[PDB]
Design a protein around this ligand. Structure first.
Ligand code: HEM
Ligand code: HEM
Ligand SMILES: [Cl-]
Ligand SMILES: [Cl-]
Ligand SMILES: [Cl-]
Ligand SMILES: [Cl-]
Ligand SMILES: [Cl-]
Ligand SMILES: [Cl-]
Ligand code: NA
Ligand code: NA
Lengths: 480, 480, 480, 480
């Protein structure tokens, strides 16, 4: 048995009735419990994520099967059997909190590893490539996909205007308009790091790496009709499914594989291996098993832990570094930036975001300082041997720069269409039909000129691809 | 033709490429256009409304048919034919911003009238009563209805626990579990002030008043199966329908009626006329036509005008005052309190929220001061005849207090069940069948003891009502 | 020995050099440690307090000498010898952070008692009365006293305009313009509750109470010239003194006394005992010793503890209640209101603001949720016997209302001048000379009409008082 | 004559009395004017600037005497007689908002030019060099100079610990401990760009540039004793002096000069010309007159205009670019980053911060959106010719990078002592005595080892310098 109290710790005498002039009169200003309770209620909500606002979280463990020390000094990967706690958030992308999990969208697949050398965040999606290759375009792309700023409803005419004028999107659209554009839930779902990163070993040697997550449950997708039948009765079916699996002891898992590529392989490929519109061949750069992640614990509070969770691709650990990928480069900035706005300056002290490894530094103050700081010395260098100092065992690598000037210029070998064609041809006939069906339903209402440009882009990917789409849309492409 | 610019007004040379070390190298910090554009992107979102987060707005006009000056000095009601501009937001209640408009919920019906004596907000719902009668309970009620704080899914076991232990909710639930719990859209929908207010005329005479909005388009509702079939294909159908009517010149309208009641009728009744769980008889207090409101204009920008719209029941104008209704009393505080958090201290300068009437006062500063203030004199009294002064022609009435002490105590004559029984019996047989069906589907999974208490509450309302519900839930109540 | 780390817990390799294109080239965006460290620096500051921005804090203990249970059920006062931890902040009033502590101003004297029945804040000043008697005037008053909104310099012509048109200020000005307007430091200083409060005992009986703190160190004050000489060499002398006394073990202390007055004495006094422009005669309502407070510990971090400290007069504990004082009434609202803005919705979780008594309630979420919440049940009533419940042993009293109606009307018997005359006459001749001197230097540049009004107000207080001031300002008042 | 109103535009009946239960009873919650007026009061303050918090602003004009088009395409410099409007803020550095203007500190000298090609901010100080050369050290440097985080008082032991361990500070300390460390006011004061920037002409040719502002009123300083005498009677004397000069038509002015240096001179020098601890010889790189800035207009409101003013070194206009200076490089980021926090995401719409040049882009939303946005198209590329497009006439230059790797490494030729020794010798004997006096008073209480290191640093600058300082501090340095 417990008293209900104010936030001052005074037991509440009456949690039913306001204080008033007799039993039916107007209310008094001197009712501290009323005003405190209402004022906190009035302040419960914080801004949702700018994208990926709808999602669900879980905790688990990652266990190493094959140590990776030949290729990376990363501590969490250093020995067979090593277990590292994780927190994971899965999400849709474009619509707000509260929106259905049956809509077409990439899915987010964000993993926070609480390592002995700091937190490492791998901020992936299910699909392994992206629509764009430079972060300067990201607000433009998002604004085109988001609901129209007048009507508040998503408009294909708007995003297809953008995508068509951005032909590097063609590979990604070829994946997203398969039925994999609507994963059945979060458990039966692919994961991908998307970018190339750099792995750096104890000798200072560097390889390029890609990450892949393979579901123990298998990959399963929904047709447009299957999605509509679910949407009719449950607009949070994937959140529900994740929670329910874990509560029942049916823990979903993913095996982590990597591909590894010598830096020197740049020069003989017909694409840029750091162009995030590209995959790497699994025949030429085979998947290598690393370990397995199992999610086995639901959060205790959705707001405190899942809504407030903060991931960033710049949360890198020794042995794992960014590549030169221009899309990645902007993400390094945008995440902690948006998080300072969304969550406050001190968002890294929110429990789910805290490292297991020690934090010592000379930062101070900021809104909601709750950590009980002490000491006179908040600057370095200083004369005190016991105060925190830099440690040169933990320097990052020094990537070679091939460029001689500060430039704004597209990468060489963009190759916008080749891999889209390759993906198209890799589809079964049944898969090709679904792609054409899904594209047609999306394109049939859009501006004719934009519709034609879309057909043209897909035709450059593969002639059959583009001709089938033209036929299905009733567009005659003879004069071209 | 226009240049794309930074916020400094410098034309942008290249809106495609980040600044990098050659065409493929990493990105430079000295790229003001990238950082500015990303940072503003990262800050687009503000907190959504704590309740009624999903909604849609429109502008229009209210015209007086019958001047109301014998009963209220309100300027906007003073003459036949007098037109007043309005802004209106319609909404659901419980789920977040992107959530479907096919869910069961009251609907918000908020009207801002830009009058010559200031803005008047009538912050209504479609349904004419409420679940509770004291604002102290509102965070409890909402927390029970909202998604479970662990799972992020709404749970009937939670809100039926609260509602059953809050028997004053019994009238409201008898309306909400009719098919009127799911209006077809925002146009074919009732509106209500819910509370009794006080109207005060030029002689200082006061009557109690209730407001009702009657749709020109008629009232239409959805069965659970009809709601599911719409939900399958459109989670924003009511937002779409409002915009589309207005874009096509098919402007929806509502006629405004009032009921008026002498203060002295308090003793003539077996309920409190300021208990918001109660309606007033239309036989005994007939509806009197006031005028008509027609919505004819969509906003130019959804975020700036609809998302940032701020209404409050305390935005009263001369001749219209609060009643002693303890639920209303809390609302007077909570809206501008939540708005200061949600929108900023200076939220009343946001264009949609600005009055048409002049604003002059001694308030100053606050975040985002954009109004070009001037002058040395920001205090009153002051010796300067030209500075703003108080005006005694605009004093409020002085309501009589019947209570002799500051108390926390329920109103007398709560009468929690009588009007619920009356509403039940007023239903057609078809309507009664839908109510039972809708209650049953909601109750069938809840805790058995709570289930029984719900049945009991409805049985106290009407024996047939409660017995039918018990039969439909397979609960044997012989022996109570 | 410790590593400097990022907020991700990664050891920092180099805390001296930014990442750049060779040893002298421009900087890279991929420098997580630079960006994180700068971005947090950029966010260190929060808004200062709207008034009382300059101040200093200390911890200590209050011990009861005489139990107060005949008069109040307050727990912290129940027994001889009972010790309660306190936090205290002392302050100036008008100028910002960083301003000198040699300026004329009331001094704040704010005490938080961490009691077994919740936190009790007594938010006093050194002087025992105030300038105004209704909170509606507080922003006007402050704006007049604050630096001019154009020039950023305080202007006597502005605040004497307000004060002279607000004759209730006349008693307060009679104390503030003694040399007690400029206390020597925070230790050698009076403290006062200012307001009448209500004390309620175990039988439900109520008395009015005033609080007084008497320094162990005695009261000492600075002449205008003494203040200037300090200001020359130390603009933070009182913050320095408080810290230094404590660091050297010379702990300052105050004895707490009360006056007590029957409610019934209202009707036979020639002033309102809840008018905060009034004191109560110490002959007629003698000082009664309660206990002693000793300050013996400096805070560990000034920002986290003293800057973030939040006091409110509405932090009342059982046995201690507001009076009807209309100035007090506004404070109940304003403090927690400002604090939600200044410190965040969860400011009560900041360590210095936390109660020692347990906190349990159904509030949730809000910016910077750090407390690891859990559970499904965030609503009451609920079916769970273990969840927090109200406790009827802790109801507040029910003050009798003597008023008929909701009114906006000055109190009866304002008596603006009588006590100001009595205080004048109580001054030694030296003290009377200082008063006249300090008033004269402040008034001599003000608008002649405002100057004459000031003289009149003081002449109504006491003829000799007003005549002396007139003589000293060279103003001939014979014709009046 | 005007009505005082609420923010809803309702005339106020009574601005003196709260609404209460009779003339003396407690206060009612239904008092919208009280709550609104107090709640806005409670939200007036915003965070002060993290450094340079104490300052004053004025408007004026800059006029070109000698067109600069041979060296820069900057529009505002393109023709003789061309006038550009400016806003200017002057400041101190380390202490908070209300702190005295008589303290030792660099002074800020920030100029915002409202040009036809956008706003150009030149964010200078009075002194022409800085303490450090890499922005990574800036929060360290500030934390050491700021008041101790425990005591709230500045401590020379703390900043001298840092500066002595940061020998690059030696030149700057040599200027700051002359009596120029305390300018007499803001008018009689030097201005400096400090950094080398790049000027780029219409042919794409680049030179290094330094900026210098020469006061029409001359340079005048205060001794320590002169400063104390002013501080005794006025802690805002420079704020006062600037306002007063302008109000009486005694407009202060500064002539702008530049030095220009070929990029190819890097190897001809024994220091790095982009090391901000270094000046360039006026013999070798002569001062060239550009034009004159006159300040002739005080702001209308100090908060709206001066407190909310936002400058950034990254507000560069075509023809003027950053140099590789690593200190500059961090500032490009930190200013808009801190401003978004301090002022809100939309701080560029605050009037003083608005460009005169047109602003069009695809940014949207954010707190306090007051600009009435419209249109469907908030993304680029898009199919619409009339929407804003990039303009390739406004590309920035492409600086040559001399580095081949991403490194964290100090510049070559730091040369920490040489220019300090040159400055020392350039002082008159009277100036040398003041420098020694000021350094001695600052150093005499610091830790002995730190004291010795300071002496060593200054002795490396010049033997006489160091020996005089050692003699004056009583430190025997013969064994070294
Ligand atoms: C320029 C490109 C991109 C930008 C600018 C960007 C920016 C952002 C931002 C600002 C957020 C909100 C973060 C928060 O509020 O805590 C976010 C979330 C997210 N992004 Fe991205 N993103 C980009 C590309 C990508 C890519 C390529 C992926 C996958 C590789 C991805 C996966 C995600 C995920 C999964 C989340 C949600 C993380 C969570 O669960 O909280 N993003 N992104
Ligand atoms: C209508 C009257 C008043 C209003 C509206 C008002 C409002 C405020 C506000 C808003 C603050 C800032 C609080 C914070 O940020 O924590 C403050 C501080 C303070 N006020 Fe008042 N105040 C009033 C009268 C008084 C009175 C009568 C006293 C003493 C009797 C007083 C003593 C103080 C003190 C000591 C502080 C500083 C709190 C601290 O140390 O942190 N005030 N006041
Ligand atoms: Cl921010
Ligand atoms: Cl640090
Ligand atoms: Cl006002
Ligand atoms: Cl707030
Ligand atoms: Cl609660
Ligand atoms: Cl843009
Ligand atoms: Na191994
Ligand atoms: Na010329």
């Amino acid at each position: 048995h417990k008293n209900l109290t104010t936030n001052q710790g005074v037991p509440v005498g009456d949690n039913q009735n306001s204080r008033t002039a007799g039993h039916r009169g107007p209310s008094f200003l001197d009712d501290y419990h009323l005003i405190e309770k209402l004022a906190h209620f009035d302040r419960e909500r914080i801004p949702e994520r700018v994208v990926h606002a709808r999602g669900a979280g879980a905790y688990g463990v990652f266990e190493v099967e094959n140590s990776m020390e030949k290729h990376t000094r990363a501590a969490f990967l250093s020995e067979e059997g090593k277990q590292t706690d994780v927190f994971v958030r899965f999400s849709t992308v474009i619509h707000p909190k509260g929106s259905p999990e049956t809509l077409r969208d990439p899915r987010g697949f964000a993993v926070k590893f609480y390592t002995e050398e700091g937190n490492y965040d791998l901020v992936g999606n299910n699909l392994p490539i992206f629509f764009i290759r430079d972060a300067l375009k990201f607000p433009d792309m998002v604004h085109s996909l988001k609901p129209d700023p007048v009507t508040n409803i998503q408009d294909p005419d708007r995003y297809w205007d953008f995508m068509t004028l951005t032909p590097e999107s063609t590979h990604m659209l070829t994946w997203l308009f398969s039925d994999e554009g609507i994963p059945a839930n979060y458990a039966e779902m692919r994961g991908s790091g998307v970018h190339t990163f750099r792995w750096v070993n104890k000798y200072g040697e560097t390889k390029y790496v890609k990450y892949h997550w393979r579901p123990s449950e298998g990959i399963r997708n929904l047709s447009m009709e299957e999605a509509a039948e679910i949407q009719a009765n449950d607009f949070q079916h994937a959140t529900r499914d994740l929670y329910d699996r874990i509560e029942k002891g049916n823990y979903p898992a993913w095996d982590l594989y990597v591909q590894l590529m010598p830096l020197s392989d740049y020069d003989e490929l017909d694409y840029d291996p750091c162009d995030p519109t590209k995959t790497w061949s699994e025949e030429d750069y085979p998947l290598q098993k690393v370990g397995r992640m199992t999610l086995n614990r639901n959060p205790e509070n959705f707001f405190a832990e899942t809504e407030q969770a903060a991931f960033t691709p710049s949360a890198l650990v020794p042995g794992i570094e960014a590549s030169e990928d221009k899309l990645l480069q902007g993400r390094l900035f945008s995440y902690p930036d948006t998080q300072r706005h969304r969550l406050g300056a001190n968002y890294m002290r929110i429990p789910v975001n805290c490292p297991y490894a020690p934090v010592h530094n000379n930062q101070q103050d900021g809104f909601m300082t709750t950590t009980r700081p002490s000491g006179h010395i908040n600057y370095e260098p200083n004369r005190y041997d016991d105060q925190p100092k830099e440690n040169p065992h933990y320097k990052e690598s020094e990537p070679v720069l091939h460029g001689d000037r500060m430039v704004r210029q597209k990468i060489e070998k963009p190759n916008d269409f080749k891999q889209a064609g390759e993906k198209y041809r890799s589809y079964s006939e049944e898969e090709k039909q679904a792609l054409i069906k899904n594209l047609t339903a999306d394109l049939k209402g859009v501006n004719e000129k934009t519709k034609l440009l879309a057909i043209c882009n897909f035709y450059r990917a593969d002639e059959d691809y583009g001709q089938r789409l033209a036929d299905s849309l009733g567009v005659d492409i003879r004069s071209y």
